[PDB]
Amino acid sequence: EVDFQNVGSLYKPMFENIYQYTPPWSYQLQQNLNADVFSGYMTNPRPFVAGANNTTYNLVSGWNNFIWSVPYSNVMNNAKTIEEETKDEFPELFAVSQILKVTAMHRVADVFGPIVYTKFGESATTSEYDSQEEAYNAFFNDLEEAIQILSDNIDSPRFTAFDLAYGGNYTNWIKYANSLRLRLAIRISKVSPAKAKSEGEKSLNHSLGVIETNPDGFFVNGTLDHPVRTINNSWGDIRMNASMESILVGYEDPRVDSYFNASEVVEGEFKGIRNGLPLLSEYDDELAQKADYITFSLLSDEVLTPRVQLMTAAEVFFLKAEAALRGWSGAGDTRTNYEQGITTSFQQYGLSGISEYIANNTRTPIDYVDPVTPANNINALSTITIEWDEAASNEEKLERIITQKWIALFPEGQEAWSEYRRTGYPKIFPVISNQSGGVVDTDLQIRRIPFVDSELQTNPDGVADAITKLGGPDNAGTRLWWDVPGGNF
């Protein structure tokens, strides 16, 4: 009984460092200045390093080390310890640890490709990477295994005292492991369609199925302040993105006021910034530029509570929409899931007007205008309408699905950044300034992050081998294994 309580104490570091709560300067580097901006969700008002940074594709490797260091320092060590102490003795403990582990580590595989996963811990001299496919094969094995163990112990209440997501209810942990597996299956759907359909159907036809109610969403019901509260409100260092303004305002989406605040730069209107701005000529340094852009829309308080969002029920309905579009057994009806996806997102924020919104076929994303620097203006790239069109092509149908999922995933930039790179949707604005020297394409946009400095330093051979598992050079232009060019079908 004492062994249990000792192990149970290792879960909170895992909960708090998937999407890192503290210190917010470390969250800023883990995610905010890569995925949160690359997704088209947010934009830093300040052109850090005189405008030569991640957002203009001149990558700051000291920042990007933290995408790797946070999960490997705080999550993978705890998971390995839990596995070693409980896999035989307390399988339910191992099971929930594996689920949290795949949660943290598929993000990493979705940034770097090859990651250290099945071989983590094996030596202090070297560390051997899995290829991304192998990492994904391990993800599916791990969820199925942990889904089986929890089903065998579904009524045990012994996790209650350590559960920041579900208060010890293994029913929810199974429905979330199913939903997570469905997400990864959707991700490998273009590159490995038989495996994707197989894995997708395993979760769609499980007796307990996937998340479908808002309380069953996966959240960390934390105590610490939301990391983005410091960045948004204390630092003024992140604001609404122009792509969010194009799509949310054009649709007259009521979530815009759940997600953002009316701006100061244009009173009573929501205003985003183009990501990828250089240090412009009108400004003598980055602080004078930030001064004119800090006045755009803040993120709103409702999305920056201590409760951190990892998987909405809305998302799962859109994963079901694409599953059905692709013909996976047990996915249900494509239109019905799409409409319910939007419904579940409104309900999440207690918003009315759903019937009018899902029937609207005249509203489109608006052109983006920058009142400070009108050279930044750009016609809306996304032209899709809301109401389901059963006669649209498979690309347009997928676009409608992925575009509403993107609204619904906010503010979790990482999942939306992966989905954008996988599908090309929604059509977020490209960068204004591409300082990659051609290593990254402006219209295709950034594809990945190169293996991190700490690994180059202390794991050189492991990195050299990991590069042979990439489908291109070790830089930000190389498509990840699930990122396949051409159609989505």
Ligand SMILES: CC(=O)N[C@@H]1[C@@H](O)[C@H](O[C@@H]2O[C@H](CO)[C@@H](O[C@@H]3O[C@H](CO)[C@@H](O)[C@H](O)[C@H]3NC(C)=O)[C@H](O)[C@H]2NC(C)=O)[C@@H](CO)O[C@H]1O
């Ligand atoms: C992109 C950018 O410039 N962001 C600004 C932040 O950098 C800044 O927060 C400060 O960040 C530095 C790191 O960048 C923090 O220093 C770190 O302190 C830790 C704690 O011991 C230490 O291990 C590190 O050596 C040291 N540097 C690094 C790279 O790890 C510093 O404590 C942060 N200060 C605060 C209040 O969080 C914020 C705040 O002004 O502004 C951002 O815009």
